[PDB]
Amino acid sequence: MNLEVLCGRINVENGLSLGEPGLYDQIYDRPGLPDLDVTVDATGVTVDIGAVPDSASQLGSSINAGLITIQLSEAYKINHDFTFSGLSKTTDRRLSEVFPITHDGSDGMTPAVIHTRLDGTIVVVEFSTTRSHNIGGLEAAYRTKIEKYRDPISRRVDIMENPRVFFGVIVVSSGGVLSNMPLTQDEAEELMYRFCIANEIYTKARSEELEAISRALSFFSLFEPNIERVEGTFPNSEIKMLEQFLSTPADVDFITKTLKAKEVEAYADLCDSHYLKPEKTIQERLEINRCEAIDKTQDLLAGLHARSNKQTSLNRGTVKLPPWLPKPSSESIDIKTDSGFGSLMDHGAYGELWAKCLLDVSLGNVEGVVSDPAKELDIAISDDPITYRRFKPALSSSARQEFSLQGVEGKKWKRMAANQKKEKESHETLSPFLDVEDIGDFLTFNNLLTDSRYGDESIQRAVSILLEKASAMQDTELTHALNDSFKRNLSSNVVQWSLWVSCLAQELASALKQHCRAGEFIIKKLKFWPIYVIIKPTKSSSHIFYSLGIRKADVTRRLTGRVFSDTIDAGEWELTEFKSLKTCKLTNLVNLPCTMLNSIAFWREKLGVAPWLVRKPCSELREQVGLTFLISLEDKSKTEEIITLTRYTQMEGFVSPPMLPKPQKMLGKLDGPLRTKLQVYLLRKHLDCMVRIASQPFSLIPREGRVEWGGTFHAISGRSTNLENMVNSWYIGYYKNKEESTELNALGEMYKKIVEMEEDKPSSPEFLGWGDTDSPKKHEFSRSFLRAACSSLEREIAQRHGRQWKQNLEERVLREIGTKNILDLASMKATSNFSKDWELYSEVQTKEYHRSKLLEKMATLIEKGVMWYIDAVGQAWKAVLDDGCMRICLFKKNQHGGLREIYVMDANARLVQFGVETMARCVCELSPHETVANPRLKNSIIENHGLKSARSLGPGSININSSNDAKKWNQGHYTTKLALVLCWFMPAKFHRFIWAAISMFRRKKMMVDLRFLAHLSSKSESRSSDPFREAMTDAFHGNRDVSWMDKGRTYIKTETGMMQGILHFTSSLLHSCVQSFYKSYFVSKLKEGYMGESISGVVDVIEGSDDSAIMISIRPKSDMDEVRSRFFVANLLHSVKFLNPLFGIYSSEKSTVNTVYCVEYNSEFHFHRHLVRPTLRWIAASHQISETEALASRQEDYSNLLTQCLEGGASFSLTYLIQCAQLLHHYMLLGLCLHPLFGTFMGMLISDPDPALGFFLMDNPAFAGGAGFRFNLWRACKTTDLGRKYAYYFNEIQGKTKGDEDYRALDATSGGTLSHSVMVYWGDRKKYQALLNRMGLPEDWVEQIDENPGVLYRRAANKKELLLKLAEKVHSPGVTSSLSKGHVVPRVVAAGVYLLSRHCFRFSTQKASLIKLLMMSSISAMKHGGSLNPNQERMLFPQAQEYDRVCTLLEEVEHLTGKFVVRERNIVRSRIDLFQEPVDLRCKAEDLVSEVWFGLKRTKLGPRLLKEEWDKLRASFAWLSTDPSETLRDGPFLSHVQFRNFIAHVDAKSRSVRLLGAPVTTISQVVRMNFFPGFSLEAEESISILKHVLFMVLNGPYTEEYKLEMIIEAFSTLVIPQPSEVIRKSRTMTLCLLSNYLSSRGGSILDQIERAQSGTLGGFSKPQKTFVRPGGGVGYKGKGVWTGVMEDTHVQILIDGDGTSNWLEEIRLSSDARLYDVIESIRRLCDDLGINNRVASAYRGHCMVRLSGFKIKPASRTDGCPVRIMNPDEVKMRVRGDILNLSVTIQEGRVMNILSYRPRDTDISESAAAYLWSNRDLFSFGKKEPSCSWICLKTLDNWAWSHASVLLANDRKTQGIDNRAMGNIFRDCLEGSLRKQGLMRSKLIAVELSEGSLDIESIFDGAPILWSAEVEEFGEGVVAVSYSSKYYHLTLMDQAAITMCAIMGKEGCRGLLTEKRCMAAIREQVRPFLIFLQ
RNA sequence: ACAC
RNA sequence: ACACAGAGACGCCCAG
RNA sequence: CUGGGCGGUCUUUGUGU
RNA sequence: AAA
C-alpha cells in the first residue's frame, strides 16, 4: 500500500543489481468481483466500483467503493493505470535529474519510479504487464523491461561515485507476478486483483511520438458524439445523408444533362450579351457597348440625383485645415499687436474669444502656453521626487450657440431650432452633378511641389544634423547626394505645411486625454511656428475641438487652390471656426509629412526622374501628389472604395476577343451615399474611365517575342502612362487609415450583411445535401456534382502522392492532435463571454459586457487538471451540446478592401473547432493546387505553367487566363456541404466527430452590441428609409416576425453560412475540389471539341479561399485554328460562372475572365514576363509602429517595414529615402516637436550615438533594406563609440569589470541588441495587474524556475511545469505586453511630452528619463576607452564574417558616375541569399547550453565536440558551470529566464530577402542594376582569383594533362591560408586542403582532411547509379556503401534509394567504444548528404543495436538498422571531368574519393581577369594569346577572332587546345551571346452544332493574330532554363555578333536559323560563323 | 504584413 | 465639425 | 443652477499563415 | 555537383 515499505524491503550493496526473478501464483482463493458499471460518455469514462466480496484472505483493502473517472485519452493504457493506483509516486522525475548527464541519447527516458531511498541510495522500479496465460509472456516482458534500462543505468552508474543502485521490474499478469523484489503475498495478490478488475473494465468499456498517436487513436475510437441528441439539437444534423453521400455513386445522366444545359445557357448569354449574331464588326460592337455603358451610367446618376439634396453649388472645403505656410523661428510668445485687442471683438464669436484669450494671457501668466525649458531641467537632473494653460472666457450666449453648431459644447444646445436645423441638414446626401472644378483645377495646378525657400529653419536644422550624424558611418558622395535629395524634398511647400500639421496633431493627441470644466478652453502655441490653437477637450472617446489663430503678418506663403476651407478674418488676425477630430482620424495627421515625402519620392522615381537631378515638376507628379494629399487629409471610408474598384475596372481592358470589355458590372457597388465633394469627383473620373475603357480595349502590341499593352491610363486623371504606374495608382486609397473607430450609428450594415442570406434560406432540406438539383436558388447544391469534384481531387491527390496517402494522413493528424497542449492554445486572442444569462435584454442593460482573453480560460483549464488539448474536447463538446448553440460576439475590423464582419468565438467553440481546423489543414497540405496551407504553390504554378506548356504544346503557344473570385464567400456555404467534402477526405474514425463539430455551426447565436440595443429599445418608432432598420426595430419590439429574433432578446439567431475565418481550410478544400473538377472538365472538353479535332492544350488551376485563377494554353496551326481554339477556350472559361452555382460558390462580379497574358492571383499582377506588384501599398504602411518596451525594437520594426518595401519592388535609392523619412518619424514620436528639452537630448545623442537610447542607424544607400538591424549594429560597433559601449557592456557580462547596480546591460532583445533601458511603465499597469490577479498563477515563479531550470527547452512533463511556463508567458516582454492595444501611433506620440524628462525608464527598481540615462552613460562609455576583440565580436555577432564580406562589396560601389541604359523587360522574383549561418561554430548557444545542462539532443555534436564547444564557451564566460544551479550564483544574472533570453536573443539567423528585378558575386549585380530604374551604377584578395581561374580551368576546352598542369601552377603561384575546423559541406576548406596537398607545408594530408571535416575522412567506395530528374539533379538509387574512418574507427555505412527518398541501411562499425559520437557525426553527414532514416532496414538477423528515426534504440525492439560491431602516399588528383576528386585508391575494386570541388558560375569577378591579363608573364597561360581570353574576360575583336578562325580552320592541334572541345564551347558561348540581342530564339457532347456567327471570322476582325507572332512563354521558370547554360554572362564574341548583324542586316541568318537558306552561297564573307556550328 |  | 440611404457622439460620476 | 476630482479609462482587434 |  506504500512504496517506501517495499522500497526499504531491499538490501543495499555495491554496484547495480538486477535481482533474481521470483515466480508468484495465487493461493488466497479470490472470491469474485464487486459492482462494476460502464457509462462511457463524451466527457470521460465513469466507472462505478462497489464493495468487494469478502475473501478468506481479506484482500481488496485499497479498492474502497466509490466513483472513479478515466479520460478517453488514457484508455489505451487502463490495465497498467489501475493496477498500480497505489504505490505509484505522486510525481514524475527524469533520469537526467537523479543521474549525471552522459549525452548517450537515453537520458530523457523517464521511468515509472525514481525513489530516493532513505539510505542515501537510488532505486528504479519499472512496471510491466503481459496479457498471456503462461510464464513465457512473463519471461519475455521481464527480458524487454530489463534490456530497456540495464545498459543506460550502467552507463550513469559508472560515473557515479556511490554505485548503490537497484532495479525493480515487476511483471504483473493474470497468473503470476514475476519480480526481482521480495513482495508480500498479500500485496501481490491485491495488485493481481486490481489488474483483473482493470482488465475487465477494459473489456466492458472498449466493446515519444508513439504515445501521442496511441492517445489520439484511443480518444477518437472511444469518443461518442451523441448523434441522437445532435439531430434533435441542431437542424439538418442527421448521419443518414452523410452515409448516403459516402455510399451512393454519382448519377452520370444528371451530370451530363446539367452540363449540357449550363453550357448552352453560357453560350446563349455569351452571344446575347457580348454582341454576337446578327453579325457585326468590332468597331460597331464597341460603339453599342459604349452606348450601353452611357445608358447604365446615366441610370446610376439619375438614381443618385433622385436621392440627393439638389444644391448644385455648395461650399465646404475638402481639406478642413487653413492653407498657410509660416516661416519658423525660435520659441517666443508675442501677444501685442498694432491695432490692439479692440478690433478683434467686432469680428464675430471667434474674434470675441480670440480677444478674450489674448487678454487673459497678456494680463496673466504664460505657464501652459508653452512648455518651459527650465522647469523640466530641474526634474531631469534630479531623481525620486502636464500643466496646460486654462482660461474661462466671457462666453456670451450667441457665441455659445455658434460653438454648439460646430460641435463645441453641443450637447446641451441639442433641441435649439438652429441646432435641429443643422442636424436635419447634416443627414442629406449630395449629388453627382455637384460641379466640382476646384478639385480638378487643384490636381493640375498646385504649388505643393514648389520649394518653400525654407532650407535653414529650426526643424530643418535639427533633422539635418541628425541625418548627418547618422550618415557619419557612410561618407560616400552617393549618401550625400541622396541626403541632399531628401533635403530638397523636405524643403517643399507641402512638407513644410505637413510639418506644422503633424506638430499640431501631436499637440492635440496629448491634449485629448486632458479634460476641462464647462466653459473652459486650453490655449497652446505650436513649437516652431507662430500658430495659436484654442482647444476644447471632451471625453477622450469623444471628439476634440480646435480653432487656429495666426498673426496674419506672419503668413509668408499660402498653399494654392480652393480645396482648403475658408477662414474668418478678425482684421489683424486670421481665425478658423472650431473643427472636430477624434482619435482614429489623428493617425493620418501625425504621419502626414512622412507620407508626403514617400509619395513625392515614389512618383519621382516612377517617372524616370533620378534623385540627384533637380528639375521642374511635370503635370503628373502634381496630380498624384495632390490626390494623395487630398485623400489622406479627408480620411473618409467611402473615398478609398472608388480607387480600389478602379483597380477591378481597369482590369477589364485586358479582356480579349471574342469578348468585349464590360466594365459596367462594377456599378452594383458604386451605388452609395456621397456626402463629400472628393467622393463626387472620384465617382465622375471613375465613370469617365469606365466609358473610355468600355469604348476601347487596351491594345496588345506584339513584338519580337515581347508583348506589351498600350493605351493604359490613370483612372482618376486623363494622362496616359505605363502599365506599372496605373497598377500602382489603383492602390492610392490605401493611404486612408485601415483602422477607424466604429460609431454606434454604424454596425447596422454589419447586421444587414449577416442576415441578408438568412431570409433567402430554403425551407425544403431535400436540396441541402440530399438530392441533385439544376439551377439552385441561393443556398442549395447537388450531391452528385460534389461527389464528382471530391472524387476528381481524390484521384489527383492519389496520382500526386502515394497509394497509402490516407494511412499517412491519419498518422499525421493523430500525431498533430496528440502532441497538442493546452498551453499551445490561448495566445492572447479575444473570446466571447456570451452565455444564457445575456440572452434576455433589460436583464443585462445594467451590466456591461466585456470580452475576455483565452489566457484566463486556459488558466482555469490548467487548474482543472487538464494538460493536453485532447483531454478538454469532451467537456467543451458537452457544454456546447447542453446549450444547443454556439455563442459568437461581434467586432468590426476595417480592411483596405470593402469591409470585414469579424465573428468572435466562445472558448469551448474554439476548443471544438481547432481539431477540425487541423484535420482540414493537413488535407489542404496534401492538395496539389492550393496555396493557403501550401505557400510554395503560389509561385510554382503560375510560373511553371509557361515551362509546362512549352514542353506539352511547343514553341509559339498562346496562353489564355482567367481570374475568378467570390462575392458571397462567407455566407452561402451551407455547413452540410463542407462536412460532406471533409468527411469524404478522411478515414472513417474521424467522421463522427467531424460531423458533430460541423453540426454545431447550424445555430449561431450572435450578440448584438448592448449600447446599440440601449438606443434601439428606447425608440419604438422606426421612421428611416432603409427597410432593415425598420425590420430590426419591429422585430425587437415584436411588431414583426423574423427567424432572426425572439421577441426581446440580445441574440440574432442565424441558420446559414460559415462565419468568416473560423473555417479557413474546409471551404478551401471545397474550392480546391471545385477547381480540380473544373480542370478535369476542361481537359475532357479540350481532348474532343469543335468537330473532334483535339485542341492541344494544358490547363492549370490555382486557388486560395475565394480568389482563384484558371489558365489554359493552346498552340494552333492556322488562322482558323487559332480563332476557333481561342473561341472554344473562351467558352470554357465563360462557363465557370454558370457551372459555379451548382456548388455553393456564387462567382463574384469583380472577376476578370479571358485575358491572354495577364493573371492576378493574390494581388500579384503577372503581365506576361513583366511581374507587377504594387509598391505604393507597402510604402504607405512604412511608418506604422508597434508599441515597444525597449527603444531599439522600434527601429527594428522600422527595418522590417522598410524590408517589406524592398520586397515590393522599390529601388534602393527610394528605399533609402523611405528610411530617411522613417528617421524623421522616429524623432517626431520621440519628441522633436513637443518636448522643450529635445535640444539637450539631441546634443547628448550627438556625443553618444547609441541604439536603444534613441539614435537611428541609417543603412548604406546602395544596399538599404536588404540588411537587417544586426548589420547596422555591427557596422556602427566597428566604426563608432558604440563599439566602446558594447565592449564595456560585454565586460560587465564577462565579469572582469564590476560596474555594479546602474549600467550592466544584462538583458537583450530580438535582433541581437542588448540594453538596460526599458520603459516598463507605459502609462501604468492597471490592465496588466487586473490580468495578473484575475488568474491564479503563483507570483513566485522565478524561485521555482531558479531551482528547476529544466523547463525552458522541454515541452511538457507535469502540471507544475505547465503552470511555470504559463507564468513565464504571462510575463514575456512581447507576447503578453504588446497584445493589449488600440490606436498605437497617437498613444505613443502622446508620450512625447514626458518621455524625455520624467521617471519612466526602469533600469533593466528606480525609474529615470532618457536624459538621466544618457547622463549616467556619459561617465561610463567615454570612461571605458576600450574596443571589441575578435572573440568578443564573434560572439556579439556570430554572422560577422558575412557582414564584412557584404561590407566589402558595399564599400566598392560608392561613386555617382554612371550611365542611364535601357530597361529590362523580363523582371522576376529572384531570391538572393545573404548572411547564411556560419559554418565555423558547429552549433548554437542555447541548444549547446541545453545539451550541457540537461542532455537534450538539440545540437548534433557529441561528447568530444560538446566538450570543445563548452571549452570555448567557458573561454567566453569564465563563470559558466556544467551544473545549472552553480551558474546562477556566479554569473551576472537574476534568473534562468534572463539567462535564456540573453542567450537566445543574440544568435545567428538565416536571413533571406526576396526581390524584384533582373534574373541572376550575385550581390554585386543587384547592387548595380537595382539602384534606380534604368540606371547602371557603373562602379569603377587571393581566393577570388583562385576561384575565377579554376572555374574556366575545369570548364574549358583544355586537355586533361594541361588541365592538371595549370591546376598545379595556379595552386603554387597563389597564396592560400590554412584551413579551418568547419562542420558542414564547405568549399574553402577543400581549396585549402587542395593547396596544402601540393605545397606540403603541413603534416600528412589525410590527417588534415580528417580534421578539417571535424573527424570525418571517407567517401563512396561503391557509388550509386545516377538518374536525371526533370531539372537536372542526378539522384542516387541502387545499392552502395560508404567507407571511411569516424572517431578512430572503421565504418562501412550502406545507402539504398529507390525514388526521391534516400533512407539509410546497415551501419557497419569496427568497435563499440564511441558509438554515440559515430551516430552524431553520421547524422550530421547524412543531413548534409541528403540521407534520412524512415525505412527500417530489411535485415532482421543477428544484431545488437537498432537505428530508427536517427535515435538510439536500446533494444532490437522496433526493428531498425543492424549496427554491427565486428597510406598517405597513394593519394593523387583525379581531374576527370570538371570534378577535382582526390581519391585514396583503397583495396582493389574501389577508389574511395575523399574530397570534391564543383566550379559554379558565380565565381567570376572583373578585377581578377584584368590582373591576370596584366600579369601574363607570370603563369603558363601567357602564351597562346588566343587563350587567356577564355580565362580573362576579354572582347575578341575582328583580328583576334580572325586569328582564332585561322587557328581552327579544319583541324589543327596545339599544346593543350584538344579537339572537339572548342566546337561545343564556342557553340554554347556564342549561341548564348547571339541570344542576348535576339537572332537565335531562346531554347528552340455539348457541341455548338458548328453554327458560327460568321464561321468565327467577323468576331475577330482587326485583331493582332498571334499564332505567327513568335511570342515567347512567360514565367520565372522560362528565364531560368534560358540561363541554365553554364556560359551565359560571357562577352567572348559579342562585338563579333554585332558586326555580323551589321554585315547581314536585321534579317541575315533568320533563314538559316529557321530553314537553311540565306542566298545558298556566301562562303568567304561569313565562313567561320558557319564553321562555328556546321 | 497578407488573405478571409 | 465627426458619424449616418436619419439608430450615435457632441463629455461621465457625486454633492448641494 | 453651480462646483469638485477620478480615470492604458471603457474594448479595440477573431481564424490561419 | 542534390538542392
Side-chain angles (χ1 to χ4, degrees), chain A residues 763-889:
Chain A
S763 45
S764 179
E766 193 192 328
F767 304 144
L768 291 179
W770 274 101
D772 299 312
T773 79
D774 184 19
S775 71
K777 288 89 183 181
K778 197 139 274 302
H779 277 283
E780 308 164 328
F781 60 94
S782 50
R783 56 168 174 82
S784 292
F785 265 78
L786 211 66
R787 198 171 193 273
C790 73
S791 181
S792 63
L793 187 49
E794 167 197 345
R795 181 174 181 177
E796 205 161 29
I797 290 179
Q799 199 170 12
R800 161 69 66 86
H801 280 91
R803 266 69 191 183
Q804 321 294 144
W805 73 284
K806 192 151 299 180
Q807 306 175 351
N808 289 95
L809 165 65
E810 169 197 307
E811 299 288 77
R812 265 200 59 204
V813 295
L814 289 181
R815 190 170 66 255
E816 286 262 2
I817 296 180
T819 51
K820 278 309 306 326
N821 293 71
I822 293 297
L823 196 45
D824 215 340
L825 298 175
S827 318
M828 298 268 300
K829 296 318 215 67
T831 70
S832 75
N833 288 340
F834 192 11
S835 47
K836 288 242 66 179
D837 149 71
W838 298 97
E839 300 202 348
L840 243 310
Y841 196 69
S842 68
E843 159 182 344
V844 296
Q845 78 199 327
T846 315
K847 56 189 192 139
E848 237 43 59
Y849 183 80
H850 292 339
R851 54 188 72 262
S852 75
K853 246 65 195 290
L854 199 44
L855 210 69
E856 304 159 10
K857 308 295 168 300
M858 272 34 251
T860 57
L861 257 297
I862 287 181
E863 267 295 87
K864 214 72 164 53
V866 179
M867 211 214 69
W868 301 103
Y869 156 74
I870 208 172
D871 286 318
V873 181
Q875 278 288 147
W877 170 247
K878 179 55 68 184
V880 167
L881 182 125
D882 277 350
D883 224 334
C885 66
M886 55 177 328
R887 261 115 209 208
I888 276 90
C889 279

Side-chain angles (χ1 to χ4, degrees), chain A residues 646-819:
Chain A
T646 59
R647 167 199 161 177
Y648 299 100
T649 298
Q650 293 192 305
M651 209 58 194
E652 291 299 297
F654 305 100
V655 181
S656 60
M659 328 191 66
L660 261 67
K662 306 288 291 177
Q664 38 260 14
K665 56 184 203 327
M666 295 269 90
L667 292 192
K669 295 179 177 297
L670 268 68
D671 41 359
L674 344 143
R675 311 194 108 90
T676 341
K677 278 109 146 294
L678 186 57
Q679 308 161 334
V680 174
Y681 177 80
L682 288 206
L683 174 64
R684 298 318 293 272
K685 301 311 289 190
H686 195 168
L687 292 190
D688 180 62
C689 165
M690 156 103 48
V691 171
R692 164 115 139 275
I693 199 166
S695 61
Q696 201 165 77
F698 283 151
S699 66
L700 184 133
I701 34 250
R703 318 235 319 276
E704 57 287 343
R706 321 297 188 121
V707 1
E708 325 297 315
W709 295 265
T712 57
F713 60 100
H714 290 277
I716 41 253
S717 55
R719 28 219 64 260
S720 178
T721 183
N722 45 307
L723 156 131
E724 266 175 328
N725 290 343
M726 164 190 59
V727 172
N728 297 17
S729 304
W730 296 340
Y731 282 77
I732 280 201
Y734 285 45
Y735 273 121
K736 140 86 174 59
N737 196 359
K738 4 187 299 304
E739 194 167 63
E740 231 107 333
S741 298
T742 301
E743 305 302 319
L744 276 176
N745 46 34
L747 299 122
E749 17 170 341
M750 159 176 293
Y751 313 141
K752 182 191 62 178
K753 282 201 58 182
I754 294 175
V755 309
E756 184 183 358
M757 297 275 289
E758 177 77 2
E759 282 72 281
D760 303 18
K761 163 213 169 186
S763 45
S764 179
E766 193 192 328
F767 304 144
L768 291 179
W770 274 101
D772 299 312
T773 79
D774 184 19
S775 71
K777 288 89 183 181
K778 197 139 274 302
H779 277 283
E780 308 164 328
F781 60 94
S782 50
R783 56 168 174 82
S784 292
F785 265 78
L786 211 66
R787 198 171 193 273
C790 73
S791 181
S792 63
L793 187 49
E794 167 197 345
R795 181 174 181 177
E796 205 161 29
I797 290 179
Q799 199 170 12
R800 161 69 66 86
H801 280 91
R803 266 69 191 183
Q804 321 294 144
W805 73 284
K806 192 151 299 180
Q807 306 175 351
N808 289 95
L809 165 65
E810 169 197 307
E811 299 288 77
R812 265 200 59 204
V813 295
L814 289 181
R815 190 170 66 255
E816 286 262 2
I817 296 180
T819 51

Side-chain angles (χ1 to χ4, degrees), chain A residues 1664-1669 1671-1677 1702:
Chain A
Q1664 293 208 340
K1665 69 181 68 182
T1666 71
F1667 81 107
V1668 180
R1669 51 182 179 263
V1674 268
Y1676 320 98
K1677 50 179 58 178
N1702 290 322

Side-chain angles (χ1 to χ4, degrees), chain A residues 1007-1199:
Chain A
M1007 166 131 292
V1008 211
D1009 199 10
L1010 264 251
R1011 311 173 199 272
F1012 184 70
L1013 301 183
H1015 319 108
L1016 182 74
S1017 63
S1018 304
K1019 186 61 177 180
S1020 300
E1021 289 78 56
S1022 299
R1023 313 170 312 114
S1024 177
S1025 68
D1026 174 68
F1028 172 75
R1029 308 164 155 259
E1030 294 104 49
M1032 181 195 287
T1033 319
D1034 278 292
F1036 195 63
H1037 289 291
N1039 321 121
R1040 248 171 88 112
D1041 276 67
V1042 296
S1043 62
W1044 48 281
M1045 253 308 293
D1046 282 321
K1047 186 43 185 58
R1049 315 295 287 268
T1050 57
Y1051 58 91
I1052 16 182
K1053 206 191 306 303
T1054 298
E1055 207 266 352
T1056 63
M1058 52 138 225
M1059 302 166 307
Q1060 175 155 209
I1062 219 71
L1063 289 198
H1064 197 46
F1065 287 116
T1066 71
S1067 55
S1068 304
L1069 208 54
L1070 163 77
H1071 202 281
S1072 66
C1073 292
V1074 173
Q1075 286 292 292
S1076 184
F1077 182 72
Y1078 280 168
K1079 181 183 149 187
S1080 182
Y1081 178 56
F1082 291 158
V1083 168
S1084 299
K1085 279 304 170 62
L1086 277 174
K1087 198 180 183 57
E1088 40 161 14
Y1090 250 139
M1091 290 301 298
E1093 298 92 317
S1094 296
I1095 302 103
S1096 61
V1098 277
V1099 43
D1100 209 327
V1101 286
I1102 193 176
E1103 67 282 343
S1105 60
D1106 61 327
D1107 212 321
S1108 53
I1110 305 181
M1111 322 167 57
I1112 309 174
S1113 296
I1114 48 177
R1115 209 274 289 272
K1117 297 295 184 176
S1118 176
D1119 291 326
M1120 47 175 180
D1121 278 329
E1122 179 208 68
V1123 181
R1124 288 168 89 265
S1125 300
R1126 203 195 277 98
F1127 195 83
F1128 188 74
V1129 175
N1131 283 254
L1132 284 176
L1133 291 181
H1134 186 84
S1135 58
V1136 168
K1137 47 222 56 55
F1138 297 93
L1139 274 158
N1140 261 3
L1142 305 180
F1143 326 106
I1145 298 302
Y1146 324 111
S1147 169
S1148 182
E1149 62 184 9
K1150 321 176 72 64
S1151 177
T1152 297
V1153 205
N1154 230 227
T1155 155
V1156 178
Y1157 296 137
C1158 1
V1159 45
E1160 38 130 315
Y1161 170 62
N1162 254 357
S1163 311
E1164 300 286 300
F1165 306 89
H1166 318 272
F1167 288 114
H1168 191 66
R1169 303 171 83 87
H1170 190 359
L1171 200 160
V1172 188
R1173 35 160 27 188
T1175 330
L1176 199 52
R1177 146 165 231 175
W1178 288 293
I1179 283 180
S1182 279
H1183 46 242
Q1184 43 183 39
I1185 38 89
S1186 183
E1187 65 285 80
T1188 52
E1189 325 297 331
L1191 211 56
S1193 38
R1194 248 168 254 195
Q1195 314 195 7
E1196 295 162 30
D1197 302 355
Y1198 274 135
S1199 183

